[PDB]
Design a protein around this ligand. Structure first.
Ligand code: CLA
Ligand code: CLA
Ligand code: CLA
Ligand code: CLA
Ligand code: CLA
Ligand code: CLA
Ligand code: CLA
Ligand SMILES: CCCCCCCCCCCCCCCC(=O)OC[C@H](COP(=O)(O)OC[C@@H](O)CO)OC(=O)CCCCCCCCCCCCCCC
Ligand SMILES: CC1=C(/C=C/C(C)=C/C=C/C(C)=C\C=C\C=C(C)\C=C\C=C(C)\C=C\C2=C[C@@H](C)[C@H](O)CC2(C)C)C(C)(C)C[C@@H](O)C1
Ligand SMILES: CC1=C(/C=C/C(C)=C/C=C/C(C)=C/C=C/C=C(C)/C=C/C=C(C)/C=C/C2=C(C)CCCC2(C)C)C(C)(C)CCC1
Ligand SMILES: CC1=C(C/C=C(\C)CCC[C@H](C)CCC[C@H](C)CCCC(C)C)C(=O)c2ccccc2C1=O
Ligand code: SF4
Ligand code: SF4
Ligand SMILES: [Cl-]
Lengths: 751, 143, 40, 73, 73, 141, 69, 80
């Protein structure tokens, strides 16, 4: 019994249990309380690791689906509160430790900074001179550009935003506590997938973009209209003045003189001065027209709100997703989607696999769309922000996708019920897993031979003094003619298949060379032989990662080698040295290998992005009109060999990282070496096995017993699974930190 | 006599003098570089102008290793001795693993505060037979 | 309650508290007496 | 030269540690008291008794080869 | 340069092989009753101490050499 | 071993079943009776339906048969413990395999002769040097 | 000769607790090869990979236990 | 085929046989332990060497030992 509010249901499907778990601190001092195999306490050091390994494995703690659902819901509230703390921290550092107003007054002669370092042990050198007398660390997160597009002009608004973010974090934390301990919703409530979808479509995504269209129209658009006109930020009215004095809007947008009447009478064209379809970019800032983005958010809101009405809830109108799914079956696929509604309404891991896959794919789509259609003012000219945002979203997407593989496998081991999947899509997938995987295997072999092998052919031909026998734009050509054709279609579209659009959706497809200040923001990104070869590298590495994770899911129950793999679990090291050796058959080990292959794929993607943008897009433009690129168009002739990537990309561009000592970039050289060290360190865990280390520990325990200093909690070597987890965690950390230091030194040292 | 001829005093070394006129400020004190120059002008520099530490054991360079060595050893013996003492004391408490994982703050602080006498404590445990164990009473693996 | 004190005396909390205290010690010593390569 | 000599000392001592500990535990340890019955080289002893990957003396040779290459580097 | 590198690599391979075959001896040829209490068996009898002190000097050298290098960096 | 009887489980097929080894080398059979027509998991992937009454199923290995057997006796509300596993050769010879003497091997049964028993401890194996240049290993002597 | 509560040191060589000390829990009847049951404070390695602890009890013969107490 | 030996420290807890996924082992009458039973390995031709039995053994170092030997179609666990 804690706080007891009235009730708060209004003929709703809301159903809760009051006070199921009392608030108490005792279990805080009882570590491992949630696991029966842990509650008694430790006896060996393994006990510690598993305590962290199983902390969020809510299935393994309780068999009750309702309690698992409640734990998940409150954990989501806690995670949202963490994200709120982080975002308010960003806004606070923008308010109190940034040069934001100074940057806003003159964004072409000052570098954004929002982290000041204290002077100690010499590290004060990291406070590089970023312009206007400001000294700090140059940020590449694009926070300043977002804040300018939103219409921030003052430190006090950022400070108020940070305070609101802290209050929101407190609210989320209290909601998590409240819905686990005070009013915990029943399993019947979570399974209302139709209502949840209606609300997340019309309410979360639809009303979200509607309110943001409101802010963009009333705050972002007039304020940026005045900012780009050269008006000093202090002379611009505050956001609320345009709402108190509507004549300001009306003189910035004459349609406002007519008000809301054109909206309700379907006379929308009157609004054509602030709801636009310009395309292209803003000539002053290099970003997307904010009016275009406001019209975009308005249309997206209408779309999502309409979508939020498909599913039936309390009123007979709408769809049952179970019915729809059951109706989709064909002569090739047995019972079709029968059973999918029951799977996705009783299995958290199935939902999480779907959602991880789609959210990772979306994060990648975000990187790809934001680089070529730069949405924020002055982001495209800031090549460091451009590179950093692209690569960051890439990595997040890749990790989410690999997690999707993990949770497909966990579904197969823990929630798949064969009596509920008789001759449906999942069952037939299991029943021809061999065809699927043997073919994916062969496609990967073909894609590797005919992508990487082309590079090896070129390296060997060039070394043999035989340039005319290479795959290149000047020899044996591999032109990507379909991508060229679609680029041409996009360039012709404003005048034919997109009449009411003035410019292209993106200048990468072709057209003018948009440059702000002396640097190009965007220009046609042409595609040739090297681009063909690297796109097939991408297809190859993606296919191999998919091969690994899909094999992990489809064989998690069994294989010809191990027909009872399901009984062994999702996470386990092997089934012994027998059958020739069965190490790494688990779904967890497939995730473990897919991590490395995803890292490979994304490393190549981001290297391709960096080199192609530095060679053929980015650069400085003379007042005569001509363009001079950062790496002088070297991609076409150098990216067609492995030696070209080793010398003209890695070797040439690493000069900034390795010479960073003695300047504000010194920390990037430090972390370059740091990533290298962590990568090398991971090889100890990956190339060895725990038996050797357990024996070494035996000798060291003898040393301790000799002086009567051996611990009661006996030291054990890491488990096989944990050895692999540590190895891969360190491999990814070291390699990614290496590339991060490299990229930041490079993109910050190239104008 | 002419020992360490390959090196010269930093106050003699002209490269050190040129670089020390440019010693950066490591803290907020606008004199940190100047204090550093004055302080390091006492060591032995090399042709490049950086100080070189002599650790062969001569007391004229005792501050280059001997004094920090003594200091570290006192502190490290302190840490190890109080840790071992707490580890011993837990063993008589029925469930020692829990107090290894959930620390007995009062007992551990009592043990930590009494560590400044760890050399004499270790000598006493050596003479009394508490420090070292016998071979025939320690578990070993097959040979 | 006893639970909160026990949680505050767990190995991770205790080790991070000791590490933070030692960090403060070393940081402030090098703030008021920096650049001690050796003993004068 | 001083620093790299101590790096060489580390490399020599670590490779010797791997090799000597493999040799001395080749006949048996507490993880495998009967290891001499299994021979110099064998895959492992299975996921039991905690897991026993790279448990043989051949495996110690294999692990020490990396440190040999590192020291030579 | 090539001669020095060549011979040092050959010597590293030789050293690793010598220790590998010491291990193989212990696996295949060692007679504990004929070498009873002699120097060989006595080495085997305190193998914990040998391995442990090798581990200690390895840790010593590693910690402090990496520390000096990273401090200088 | 006379002639195997029993309906095949109701199943639409899969790619995970028998290969060339089954006809060239050897295959395996498992029979069992079920009180009801009911769903079970194929060790080769997917779901199948066992018939009410007798059931006869062919698999590629002995291990797949024993995995199906554990599933039968540990994953159905009334257990299925009457399953029999046979080895089948291309000549047609059928070799009854499991349960070997009509009694599951986990429980003692009179009449079984100890195989692979040693009258010593593991630590009492002889030194390998004492048996070198022979064909044996310390556990074989 | 052993009784419940006796502290004994293990002498089996191949046993995990050779040189370590356990306490006698029960003594089985004659005709059995290893009648003396000993319990230990330190678990052994027993368990599949990743298991929290191990087995802390084992049977021995009198010639394998050395009375300490 | 792999070799499977059963030494006299067997307590006859039957976990040997319960863990075997290929029915290599049996419980046969014996007299060395209280349970009056011991493990036997009459069908090592079907052994694959997964080591589940030893993973199940409780005695201080195993009473059942699997030594991998001459690899066959059966011992390599081949379905083809
Ligand atoms: C002071 C308020 C309070 C109290 C005393 C309790 C009491 C209890 N809770 Mg509850 N809970 C609270 C707040 C509180 N909760 C909040 C705010 C949430 C929303 C996240 C939840 C959601 C929740 C769930 C889902 C569960 C519990 C459980 C439990 C029980 C076990 C707790 C434990 O394992 O040790 C204490 C553990 C910790 C303190 C974790 C350490 C902190 C983590 C590692 C990081 C911090 C994240 C944090 C939640 C958010 C960040 C804060 C932000 C400012 C950055 C226990 C009786 C569990 C249970 O019922 O056991 C069966 C259970 O599953 N609680
Ligand atoms: C329009 C109604 C609505 C809205 C806005 C949401 C929104 C959300 N839901 Mg919810 N849900 C709803 C209805 C709604 N739901 C219903 C009817 C059900 C029952 C079927 C559920 C059951 C459900 C479950 C089980 C879960 C969610 C979760 C989530 C969150 C995950 C997505 C996210 O993090 O996005 C972005 C995040 C934000 C934008 C942060 C803002 C969050 C605040 C609290 C929302 C305030 C809006 C509110 C209407 C006030 C607006 C008025 C005015 C200020 C304009 C999200 C904030 C998941 C979650 O995270 O749990 C906490 C979760 O597991 N929903
Ligand atoms: C959630 C986002 C959001 C928010 C909260 C606001 C908020 C506001 N807007 Mg804005 N706006 C938005 C989105 C948003 N807008 C979008 C998407 C557009 C693009 C279409 C606009 C374009 C816009 C314009 C052009 C104007 C505003 C104006 C205003 C202000 C006064 C309007 C009002 O609320 O009075 C209350 C509204 C009413 C009482 C409506 C009643 C009038 C009609 C006749 C009723 C018809 C309703 C009926 C059910 C439909 C049937 C009609 C049919 C039978 C003929 C107000 C603070 C006005 C302003 O003040 O300018 C600064 C103004 O001129 N907005
Ligand atoms: C919304 C996304 C999401 C959700 C909520 C889950 C949920 C869950 N996952 Mg999953 N997964 C995800 C994404 C997600 N995962 C991703 C992105 C991946 C790819 C890496 C995976 C791969 C995966 C695997 C392989 C496994 C899980 C497992 C689990 C379960 C246990 C959680 C746990 O391990 O506890 C505690 C968490 C930890 C101990 C993490 C500590 C180690 C991290 C990686 C260090 C990170 C370092 C840091 C980021 C940077 C360095 C800082 C440092 C220098 C200080 C849990 C139910 C486990 C399971 O058994 O499922 C039932 C498991 O086996 N997941
Ligand atoms: C550069 C190192 C390297 C290389 C060459 C490979 C090679 C390969 N890996 Mg692999 N991998 C690596 C590192 C590497 N891996 C690491 C570190 C890991 C740990 C995570 C993995 C883990 C891993 C997994 C889990 C998988 C692979 C897969 C594959 C295969 C993909 C199919 C393919 O590319 O077909 C074509 C082969 C090539 C492109 C290799 C180069 C061939 C050259 C260019 C031509 C050969 C010339 C000629 C034959 C020379 C003959 C000389 C003459 C004297 C005989 C492929 C053969 C996947 C697979 O098997 O897919 C089916 C698979 O699932 N890898
Ligand atoms: C692991 C080997 C190692 C060693 C040998 C050193 C050694 C040193 N480093 Mg370095 N460092 C290392 C690793 C190492 N570092 C690494 C890995 C990094 C990267 C993070 C750094 C990065 C680094 C930087 C950036 C700096 C140093 C500095 C220093 C010097 C400062 C000494 C000092 O603070 O005065 C002496 C300090 C004390 C006496 C305080 C210690 C606290 C005591 C215990 C207080 C308690 C008193 C107690 C009662 C004892 C009193 C006596 C008692 C008996 C009565 C010193 C010579 C600083 C310097 O000035 O360089 C010359 C400097 O700025 N280091
Ligand atoms: C850069 C790569 C790398 C590193 C750092 C190590 C590290 C080590 N190895 Mg290893 N090894 C490697 C590669 C590496 N290995 C590879 C590729 C293989 C082939 C598989 C092996 C195989 C191998 C074997 C078989 C053995 C070793 C041994 C050792 C230890 C030697 C003693 C020593 O140096 O003491 C000092 C330790 C270090 C310098 C490393 C730690 C560095 C960190 C920074 C210390 C600071 C702690 C840090 C702050 C912790 C907080 C983390 C926090 C941020 C989350 C040491 C810990 C031997 C051993 O165990 O000796 C007893 C041993 O038997 N290695
Ligand atoms: C760059 C692209 C241009 C190059 C063309 C390449 C042609 C590729 C082959 C055509 C696609 C075949 C799938 C649709 C054909 C199709 O779905 O037919 C329909 C059929 C099922 O139809 P039903 O009548 O059963 O529909 C009932 C549904 O409700 C589901 O229950 O699907 C199957 O039979 C499953 C077999 C899929 C196995 C084929 C997949 C092979 C993988 C390779 C595909 C590469 C595509 C790459 C493009 C991104
Ligand atoms: C007391 C204590 C313990 C244990 C202590 C024990 C048991 C220690 C045992 C030590 C042993 C057995 C041996 C030690 C041998 C030490 C040697 C041989 C030191 C040699 C050093 C030399 C030759 C130094 C020389 C240089 C001299 C200074 C002579 C110069 O300028 C530099 C330089 C390097 C030349 C614990 C572990 C239990 C608890 C800890 O807190 C402390
Ligand atoms: C300085 C000098 C000098 C001196 C010298 C000396 C004194 C030295 C020697 C040296 C030495 C002395 C060295 C060494 C080394 C060693 C080693 C390197 C080792 C080894 C071994 C191995 C490798 C193996 C082993 C084994 C095993 C493992 C087991 C079984 C048995 C056997 C043996 C096989 C003089 C004065 C003269 C001159 C001048 C200078
Ligand atoms: C080195 C190694 C070990 C030994 C590693 C061990 C025993 C882990 C040692 C970790 C120490 C005890 C903790 C140090 C790291 C901490 C988690 C970091 C905490 C730092 C805070 C105090 C700030 C294995 O057990 C192993 C197992 C399987 C394959 C490979 C390997 C392997 O390579
Ligand atoms: S090597 Fe390790 S993972 Fe592989 S089978 Fe042996 S014990 Fe298992
Ligand atoms: S082999 Fe070991 S664990 Fe299995 S029944 Fe025999 S004595 Fe018990
Ligand atoms: Cl080249």
């Amino acid at each position: 019994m804690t706080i007891s509010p009235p009730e708060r249901e209004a003929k709703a499907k809301v159903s809760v249990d009051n006070n199921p778990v009392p608030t108490s601190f005792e279990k805080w001092g009882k570590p491992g309380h949630f696991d029966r195999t842990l509650a008694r306490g430790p006896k060996t050091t393994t006990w510690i690791w598993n305590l962290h390994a199983n902390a969020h494995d809510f299935d393994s703690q309780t068999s009750d689906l309702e309690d698992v659902s409640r734990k998940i819901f409150s954990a989501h509230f806690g995670h949202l509160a963490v994200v709120f703390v982080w975002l308010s921290g960003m806004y606070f550092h923008g308010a109190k430790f940034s040069n934001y107003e100074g940057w806003l007054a003159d964004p072409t002669h000052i570098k954004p900074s929002a982290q000041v370092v204290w002077p100690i042990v010499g590290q004060g050198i990291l406070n590089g001179d970023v312009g206007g007398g400001f000294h700090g660390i140059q940020i590449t997160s694009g926070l300043f550009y977002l804040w300018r597009a939103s219409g921030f002009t003052d430190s006090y608004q950022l400070y108020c935003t940070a305070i609101g973010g802290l209050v929101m974090a407190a609210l989320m934390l209290f909601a998590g506590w409240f819905h686990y301990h005070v009013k915990a919703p029943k399993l019947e409530w979570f399974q209302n997938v139709e209502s949840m979808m209606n609300h997340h479509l019309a309410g979360l995504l639809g009303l979200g973009s509607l309110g943001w269209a409101g802010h963009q129209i009333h705050v972002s658009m007039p304020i940026n209209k005045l900012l780009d006109a050269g008006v000093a930020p202090k002379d611009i009215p505050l956001p609320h003045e345009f709402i108190l004095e509507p004549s300001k809007m009306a003189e910035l947008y004459p349609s406002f003189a007519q008000g809301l009447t054109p909206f309700f009478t379907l006379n929308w064209g009157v609004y054509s001065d602030f709801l636009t379809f310009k395309g292209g970019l803003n000539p002053v800032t290099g970003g997307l027209w904010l009016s275009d983005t406001a019209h975009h958010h308005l249309a997206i809101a209408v779309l999502f709100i309409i979508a939020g009405h498909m599913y039936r809830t309390n009123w007979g109108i709408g769809h049952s997703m179970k019915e729809i799914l059951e109706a989709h079956k064909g002569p090739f696929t047995g019972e079709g989607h029968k059973g999918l509604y029951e799977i996705l309404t009783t299995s958290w891991h199935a939902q999480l696999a779907i959602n991880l896959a789609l959210l990772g794919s979306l994060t990648i789509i975000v990187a790809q769309h934001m680089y070529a259609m730069p949405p924020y003012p002055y982001q495209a000219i800031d090549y460091a922000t451009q590179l950093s945002l692209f690569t960051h979203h890439m990595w997040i997407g890749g990790f989410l996708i690999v997690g999707a593989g993990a949770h497909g496998a966990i579904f197969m081991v823990r929630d798949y019920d064969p009596a509920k999947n008789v001759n449906n899509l999942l069952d037939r997938m299991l029943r021809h897993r061999d065809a699927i995987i043997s073919h994916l295997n062969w496609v990967c072999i073909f894609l590797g031979f005919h992508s990487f092998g082309l590079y090896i052919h070129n390296d060997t031909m060039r070394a043999l003094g035989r340039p005319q026998d290479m795959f290149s734009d000047t020899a044996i050509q591999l032109q990507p003619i379909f991508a060229q054709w679609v680029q041409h279609l996009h360039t012709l579209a404003p005048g034919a298949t997109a009449p009411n659009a003035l410019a292209t959706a993106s200048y990468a497809f072709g057209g003018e060379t948009i440059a702000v200040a002396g640097k190009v923001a965007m220009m046609p990104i042409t595609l040739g032989t090297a681009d063909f070869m690297v796109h097939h590298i991408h297809a190859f590495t993606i296919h191999v990662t998919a091969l690994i994770l899909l094999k992990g899911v489809l064989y998690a129950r069994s294989s010809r080698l191990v027909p009872d793999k399901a009984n062994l679990g999702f996470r386990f090291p092997c089934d012994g040295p027998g059958r020739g050796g069965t190490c790494q058959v688990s779904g967890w080990d497939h995730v473990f290998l897919g991590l490395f292959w995803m890292y490979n794929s994304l490393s190549i993607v981001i290297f391709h992005f960096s080199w192609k943008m530095q060679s053929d897009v980015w650069g400085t433009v003379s007042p005569d009109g001509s363009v001079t690129h950062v790496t002088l168009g070297n991609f076409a002739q150098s990216a067609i060999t492995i030696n070209g990537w080793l010398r003209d990309f890695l070797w040439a561009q690493a000069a900034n990282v390795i010479n960073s000592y003695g300047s504000a970039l010194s920390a990037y050289g430090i972390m370059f070496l740091a990533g290298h060290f962590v990568f090398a360190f991971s090889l100890m865990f990956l190339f060895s096995g725990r038996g050797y280390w357990q024996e070494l520990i035996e000798s060291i325990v003898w040393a301790h017993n000799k002086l009567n200093v051996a611990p009661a909690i006996q030291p054990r070597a890491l488990s096989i699974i944990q050895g692999r987890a540590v190895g891969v965690a360190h491999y990814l950390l070291g390699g990614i930190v290496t590339t991060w230091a490299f990229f930041l030194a490079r993109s910050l040292s190239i104008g | 006599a002419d020992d360490f001829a390959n090196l010269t005093p930093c106050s003699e070394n002209p490269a050190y003098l040129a670089k020390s006129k440019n010693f950066l400020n490591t803290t907020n004190d606008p004199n940190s570089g100047k204090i550093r120059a004055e302080r390091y002008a006492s060591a032995l520099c090399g042709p490049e102008g950086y100080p070189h530490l002599i650790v062969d054991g001569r007391f004229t360079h005792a501050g280059d290793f001997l004094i920090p060595s003594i200091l570290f050893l006192y502190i490290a013996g302190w840490i190890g001795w109080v840790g071992r003492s707490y580890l011993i004391e837990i063993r008589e408490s029925k469930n020692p693993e829990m107090q290894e994982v959930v620390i007995n703050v009062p007992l551990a602080i009592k043990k930590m505060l009494g560590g400044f006498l760890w050399p004499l404590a270790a000598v006493g445990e050596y003479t009394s037979g508490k420090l070292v164990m016998k071979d025939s009473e320690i578990p070993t693996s097959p040979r | 309650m006893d639970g909160l004190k026990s949680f505050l005396s767990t190995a991770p909390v205790m080790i991070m508290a000791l590490l933070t205290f030692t960090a403060g010690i070393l940081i402030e010593f090098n703030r008021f007496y920096p650049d001690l390569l050796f003993h004068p | 030269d001083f620093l790299v000599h101590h790096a060489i000392a580390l490399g020599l001592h670590t490779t010797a540690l791997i090799l000597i500990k493999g040799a001395l535990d080749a006949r048996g340890s507490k993880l495998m008291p009967d290891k001499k019955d299994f021979g110099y080289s064998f895959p492992c002893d299975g996921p039991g008794r905690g897991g026993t990957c790279d448990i043989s003396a051949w495996d110690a040779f294999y692990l020490a080869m990396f440190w040999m290459l590192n020291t030579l580097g | 340069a090539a001669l020095y590198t060549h011979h040092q690599y050959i010597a590293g391979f030789l050293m690793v092989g010598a220790f590998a075959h010491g291990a193989i001896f212990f696996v295949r040829d060692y007679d504990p009753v004929a070498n009873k209490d002699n120097v060989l068996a006595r080495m085997l009898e305190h193998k914990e101490a040998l391995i442990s002190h090798l581990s200690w000097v390895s840790l010593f050298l590693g910690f402090h050499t990496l520390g000096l290098y990273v401090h200088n960096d | 071993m006379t002639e195997l009887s029993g309906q095949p489980p109701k199943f639409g097929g899969s790619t995970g079943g028998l290969l060339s080894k089954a006809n060239r080398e050897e295959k395996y059979a498992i029979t069992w009776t079920s009180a009801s027509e009911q769903v079970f998991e194929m060790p080769t992937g997917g779901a199948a339906i066992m018939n009410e009454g007798e059931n006869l199923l062919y698999l590629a290995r002995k291990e797949q048969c024993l995995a199906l057997g554990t599933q039968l006796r540990t994953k159905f509300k009334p257990k299925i413990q009457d399953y029999k596993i046979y080895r089948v050769y291309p000549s047609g010879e059928v070799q009854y395999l499991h349960p070997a003497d009509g009694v599951f091997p986990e429980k003692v049964n009179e009449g079984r002769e100890a195989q692979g028993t040693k009258t010593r401890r593991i630590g009492q194996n002889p030194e390998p040097v004492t048996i070198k240049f022979s064909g044996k290993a310390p556990y074989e002597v | 000769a052993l009784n419940r509560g006796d502290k004994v040191r293990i002498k089996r060589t191949e046993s995990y607790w050779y040189g370590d000390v356990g306490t006698v829990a029960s003594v089985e009847k004659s005709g059995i090869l290893y009648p003396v049951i000993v319990r230990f404070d330190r678990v052994n390695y027993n368990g599949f990979s990743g298991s929290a602890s191990g087995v802390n009890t084992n049977n021995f013969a009198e010639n394998e236990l050395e009375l300490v107490q | 085929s792999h070799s499977v030996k059963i030494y006299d420290t067997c307590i006859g807890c039957t976990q040997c046989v319960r863990a075997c996924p290929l029915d290599v082992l049996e419980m046969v009458p014996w007299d060395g332990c209280k349970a009056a039973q011991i493990a036997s390995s009459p069908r090592t031709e079907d052994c694959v060497g997964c080591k589940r039995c030893e993973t199940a053994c409780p005695t201080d170092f195993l009473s059942i030992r699997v030594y991998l030997g001459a690899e066959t179609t059966r011992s390599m666990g081949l379905a083809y």
